[PDB]
Amino acid sequence: AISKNLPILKNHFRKHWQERVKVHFDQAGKKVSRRNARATRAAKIAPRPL
Amino acid sequence: GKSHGYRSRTRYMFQRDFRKHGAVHLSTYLKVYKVGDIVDIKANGSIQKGMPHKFYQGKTGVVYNVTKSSVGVIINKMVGNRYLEKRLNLRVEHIKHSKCRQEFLERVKANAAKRAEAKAQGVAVQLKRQPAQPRESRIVSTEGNVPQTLAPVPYETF
């Protein structure tokens, strides 16, 4: 279970990591939510900077 | 267990010789060794310092280093599928010169003499050596040599 001649790696995957993998598909969906969130806050705080 | 010591299996080779025991004769020490000089390796068991391993006994190398009581020899050591550059440190009683290289280095001067001579004369030198040629056509004369008719022998005990 040791190399031919390879750098000694430290891959921290001996826990149940598969149960708390967080993939960011929500990136684009959050981006429009943040822009809408800014637009609505600027409508509320009507003439003033955010 | 098994024995793989340094001087193991070396009863008969580091043995001295019959009626050649005792002291080393002084020509051995008066002999001059220089770098690029091809030398044999053959240990003198009577001298137990700078002595070569039994492997190198019989080998021929070339001197690379020269110091006080000793030389340095380069030998070709095949191990598996490839030679390495094995550097020995040998006291001067365990080596000698190679007439191998002495007979070449005099043939070089013999060729130099033949060519430098025959450049300004009638030339048929052929500097290269040729092997044992098939013998030429001779007449064998039977004047007091009338061939003796040999026959094969009958069997007899003792």
């Binding site: 001649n5 390879l6 750098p7 000694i8 790696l9 | -």
Partner: protein, 184 residues
């Protein structure tokens, strides 16, 4: 039929670029033609150097070009780089030259033009020098890539260990000093 060598062994050399680049194949086409017809040893070198891969066409710096023209008698030759010609801001003096590269960098193009020189391709070169008349073929250093310092590591080679972190606690303790066991 006691075969002396390996039967059906390939030459082991590139006969084409594994690059599928259209413009490189047009350039190979020109130089396969010139290589065949001209019978000048230059054209065979350029054809092979075009086949060569990214690891074997390392960037020849302007500073290395300036040095190759510092040579006596070879001061007015056209500088054939088969690969990238990179910039070097280390030097200040650069002479008037003509250099035939595959690619230049925006910095290298600026420096060679500003000296007053001519940035050539291999086809702009071939149209003026079919036999590489008055050329100086250069190569960048191959054995300087960071991968080559790990090639044939062992005791006691003095080669780079393949590692990811480089401080103490990382491959200095036992077998790198006589204190802890031994050294290499």
């Amino acid at each position: 039929i006691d075969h002396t060598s390996k039967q059906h062994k390939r030459s082991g050399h590139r006969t084409a670029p594994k690059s599928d680049n259209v413009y490189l194949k047009l350039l190979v086409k020109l130089y396969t033609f010139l290589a065949r017809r001209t019978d000048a040893p230059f054209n065979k070198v350029v054809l092979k150097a075009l086949f060569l891969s990214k690891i074997n066409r390392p960037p020849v710096s302007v500073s290395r070009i300036a040095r190759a023209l510092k040579q006596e008698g070879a001061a007015n030759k056209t500088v054939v780089v088969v690969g990238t010609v990179t910039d070097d801001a280390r030097i200040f003096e650069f002479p008037k030259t003509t250099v035939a590269a595959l690619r230049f960098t925006a910095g290298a193009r600026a420096k060679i033009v500003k000296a007053g020189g001519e940035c050539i391709t291999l086809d702009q070169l071939a149209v003026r020098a079919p036999k590489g008349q008055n050329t100086l073929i250069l190569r960048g250093p191959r054995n300087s890539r960071e991968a080559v310092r790990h090639f044939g590591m062992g005791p006691h080679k003095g080669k780079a260990p393949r590692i990811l972190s480089t401080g103490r606690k990382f491959e200095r303790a036992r077998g790198r000093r006589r204190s802890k066991g031994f050294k290499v």
